[PDB]
Symmetry: C5
Subunit: 268 residues, 5 copies
Amino acid sequence: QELGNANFENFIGATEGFSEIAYQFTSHILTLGYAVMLAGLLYFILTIKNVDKKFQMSNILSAVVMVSAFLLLYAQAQNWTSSFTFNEEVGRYFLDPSGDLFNNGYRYLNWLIDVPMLLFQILFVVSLTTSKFSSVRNQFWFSGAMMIITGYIGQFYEVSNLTAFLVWGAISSAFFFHILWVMKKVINEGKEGISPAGQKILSNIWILFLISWTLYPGAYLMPYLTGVDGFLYSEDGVMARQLVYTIADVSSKVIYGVLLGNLAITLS
Amino acid sequence: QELGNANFENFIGATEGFSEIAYQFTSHILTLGYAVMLAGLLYFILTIKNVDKKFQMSNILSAVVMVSAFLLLYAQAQNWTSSFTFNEEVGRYFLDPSGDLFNNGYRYLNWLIDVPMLLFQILFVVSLTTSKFSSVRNQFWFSGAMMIITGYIGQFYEVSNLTAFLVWGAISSAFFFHILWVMKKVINEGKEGISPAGQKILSNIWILFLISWTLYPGAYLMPYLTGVDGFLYSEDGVMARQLVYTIADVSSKVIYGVLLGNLAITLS
Amino acid sequence: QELGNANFENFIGATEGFSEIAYQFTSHILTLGYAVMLAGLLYFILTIKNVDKKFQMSNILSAVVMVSAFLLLYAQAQNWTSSFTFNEEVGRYFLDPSGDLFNNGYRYLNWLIDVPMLLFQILFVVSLTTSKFSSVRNQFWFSGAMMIITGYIGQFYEVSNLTAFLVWGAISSAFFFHILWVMKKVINEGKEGISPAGQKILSNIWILFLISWTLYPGAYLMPYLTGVDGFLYSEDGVMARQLVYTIADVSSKVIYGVLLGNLAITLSK
Amino acid sequence: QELGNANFENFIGATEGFSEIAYQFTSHILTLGYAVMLAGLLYFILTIKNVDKKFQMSNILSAVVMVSAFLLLYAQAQNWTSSFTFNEEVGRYFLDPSGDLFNNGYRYLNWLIDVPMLLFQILFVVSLTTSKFSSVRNQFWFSGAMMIITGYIGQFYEVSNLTAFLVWGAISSAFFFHILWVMKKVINEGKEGISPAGQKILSNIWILFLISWTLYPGAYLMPYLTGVDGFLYSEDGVMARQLVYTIADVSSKVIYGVLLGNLAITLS
Amino acid sequence: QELGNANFENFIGATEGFSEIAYQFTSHILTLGYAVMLAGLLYFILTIKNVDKKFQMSNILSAVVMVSAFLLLYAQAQNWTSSFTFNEEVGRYFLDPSGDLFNNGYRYLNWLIDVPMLLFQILFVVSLTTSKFSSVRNQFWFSGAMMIITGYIGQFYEVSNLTAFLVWGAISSAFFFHILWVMKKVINEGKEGISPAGQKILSNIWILFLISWTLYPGAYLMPYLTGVDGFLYSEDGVMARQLVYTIADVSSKVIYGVLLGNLAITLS
Ligand SMILES: CCCCCCCC/C=C/CCCCCCCC(=O)O
Ligand SMILES: CCCCCCCCCCCCCCCCCCCC
Ligand code: NA
Ligand code: NA
Ligand code: NA
Ligand code: NA
Ligand code: NA
């Protein structure tokens, strides 16, 4: 069977197949994913009037991200269930090519919305002391775009060409480190001239940002984190990857948005 | 045939099949389920301005839960109809593997939204006395998560491994008892310093909470409540399980939310 | 072919099949059905601020009913088209078992929302005199639930067991008569102490309620209203049943809601 | 092949089939149709507060019509694509019976919403002089209903029985002429006691009403407007019918609604 | 195989087929497309109260365009996935005629909404000096309609008849040049008598308009921009065409709308 430049989920699905637990769990975690985003959308719209006019752009950009996340995770949930079909003889779900191959790439291109907006929205709550608003925004947007596009190219080769996969991943990581650098500056300048309560929240935001954003490259490498022919190059790795994505999505978008809202309230 | 770690609905559907009444009833009760949640969503949004600003977070969290419940029950209703197909020769609906196996697990993972939010929202209406807000919240959220996750693991073995099914269920019950304990404290502290009218409503809320939340473990054990090869290990048990879930869902989310709203009005 | 405890639509569909007119008409009337409910939802939300705060719960409960009706009629419309497939050799639509058997039961269980809310909402516009609010509400809700549940059980036997069908229908009718009784009291007490304009509207509401609610038991008996092998035990009866349901749904929910809104306006300052 | 009392689209689709242009164009025009209605819905809701309270019922009834039109045109667009399937051997789309026969009847029954509401809404903007509000409303609603129902019956026989088709069409036309008569009176009385600017708009509304409403009977006769076995009794007539419907739908509902709104602003 | 007057995507899909990257990328870019439009819809509605009453029509028309774009790009995304199916023997996606042929024509007919509204909305923010409002509007609407209709006819022949394709394209370009002419005048008159800030934004709007609108004819010619049997007459050209459309859609509708909103704020 010829799959070409396809994600490893298809190789596991085409050879070993997926147990009821592996298939159902992946279906459930992706379903919880889009449910959280639509719930978040409602929360961000309904709490818009809870902060001063100047901070409301944060709620609006959170809502924008929720729409992106909901549509993508909904599409990705349908893509999962249509790509793997139950075989009654062996009692496992195997690649059903009529449903198309499964691809994580859907997520990557929608990050062209999420990443720029998530980085932009904090600049509407915090006050910079040294750094220029337009300069920070432009660095976030340029590095964000390059990080996503290079990673998008890389993930197509996660099985067909391990070398390209790692090189593109490495280039992508360079832009990621730059984003972490600039965000650290923004957090530090943001802490200057606000109440200790506000400073505590910004500290929490930095930890959340650091861990949640790092999970994405984790999901990228997931199948190989226990090396070639490891425990994770199986249905277990498939489950782990989608679980990690869902934890990252909720943390980086919904919880991040809630914390920014709480900061906005303390500064109001 | 080989089903593996699948819910008992699939075993009944694969062997005996479902009569028109059993199949249609299950379809109708799940349809009523999601209809009630979307109707509730509209009610909670439209009555937001009927309570003082400080109580409006209760309406908002009810709305959040309604979105979760609607999406899940809608998906679960489609999963039911796609998993069982009519056999014209015998006049019964049999497992159709091309629609995937039916799994109640969808509900469990969405409880990661419902349970934490349902427990949290009462803390925006009642005033604690001796207990700390953050302490009660953290206990609810930790015990809630552990209760759900342990039960989620257990239900995959309700047929393939009765021992694992009961052990995980037992561990889950421990966390359930802790939640009941903390909620009892919250209700008692909540009754302190409010009108007898408010105290009457809180008393009703406690009864509703107790009965409605107990129905869930009831649904878990349903197939075995009349022992192995009992009256309930049949299409009758399948009907009973989904009926009990629907009664529990409407009571625990919609009716609970309405009572909290009425309490909020009394305190306004 | 073995169908069991199935609605008569499936027996006609499995034996005679449906002409283009019968199949298309049923599809069109169910489509109009859900379209009216979504349009009504928008109307009730957009006119909320046209009445005093105390009457706004009427608009809200109308909206709640519209959501229920829309979702159910939309589902029922899809169920119809998926259950009957065209046979090119004879030019008729026949039962397609892969789409599931057609069942009217979907409606019945959603009435557990509609009936209680429709009866409850009038108590937010009219003022009772000799009757207690909680007492009337409880009678409406208990009798409403029993009426629906008994009818739901009955309709599964409309072909497989005519006796069970009629017995459950009869029991259901008892609870229906009780509802009509209580509603009559509510209308009379509602007329007391309001302008003749308001009394006129309440009179219209009573007529609408009486006719529209009676259509439902009419739809129940439809296949047998011309006897066991009659004109109506055909695709004509299938068309008639869904037509009557749609007329009853629009009248009992949408038009009823509009009249209550107009009453609320007349009582408003 | 036996089709019975079916629309002529099915006869062309079953014999000649449809070229890529004919099939795609019909799909595109119906898609544009429902897109316009959802866009209009948004416009009528967002401009509600642009007119005095007394004229807002016009926006509300426009919105009601948009919901009707959107749902129907969306359904009709799906019905078209599911009823005709590509034959790779000859490169044309042929009747696919598994998708059901195509029927324009969907439109007719939804006119039971559109026609009464479109006629009613003008009575909330203009002031009658000689005529009674209730009398005009009742004539519009009775004649509207009879016009639609008689036409609905007629269109089922547009191929199977040309005589019935024309007789029902003729009876329907009688009720149409009555509506045109009453609307003319309403326009004239509406012009009395308003600014020349308002009178100009009412003049435009009358022209729009006359042309747009006449297109519907045009669509009815379309297949026979060049006689039996004419140029239009082909895929060309199929294209022309759906094009004319779309032009009529946009003009009679959306543009009509906009003009009434502009009149309401002039009178505010 | 006989395709007739079909888009070149179908010819590549029927002969060479599409690699995983080509098929997935096209699916991802179209998905990002509709996601951006629904996110934009939310942004334009939520920021309506950020500008003076007289400028709010701009937000409303942006919202109207977003509804059009969302519905069309959503439909086009579904059309793409249903028209090409994976062949497990060769590992490529081939034309699946049961899903209908793919056609870009969907976009063209929805431009009958987008183009007129995009050109109209700027006239609600800028003040004309020498030019008459009604005159400019009428020229935009007439030339817009003719540009779209002529291009719509042309694209059906992009493979079956290269001559017709180029002639209709040329006629269409004439109307395009007229639009560019009128828009240049509007921008110049708009710049007269407003703040430096306002003039800067109008300058940006003109550049964005010029580049973004030119991309559309670029997408039209895409398959032949490297001559007959060139590098772009392949799956690479298919990818490039949909990519260019998506860049043009986001720029011409969303970014254009945001800039107009920012101009409205500076003038408020
Ligand atoms: C598929 C159904 C899911 C519906 C949920 C989608 C959410 C989109 C937002 C809609 C609700 C927001 C309405 C604005 C709040 C009104 C404020 C108020 O009434 O006080
Ligand atoms: C591929 C590009 C994705 C970007 C589009 C995201 C969705 C549209 C939302 C628009 C975002 C606007 C950003 C705010 C502009 C700041 C202007 C200042 C106002 C005071
Ligand atoms: Na599957
Ligand atoms: Na089924
Ligand atoms: Na069908
Ligand atoms: Na087709
Ligand atoms: Na495909």
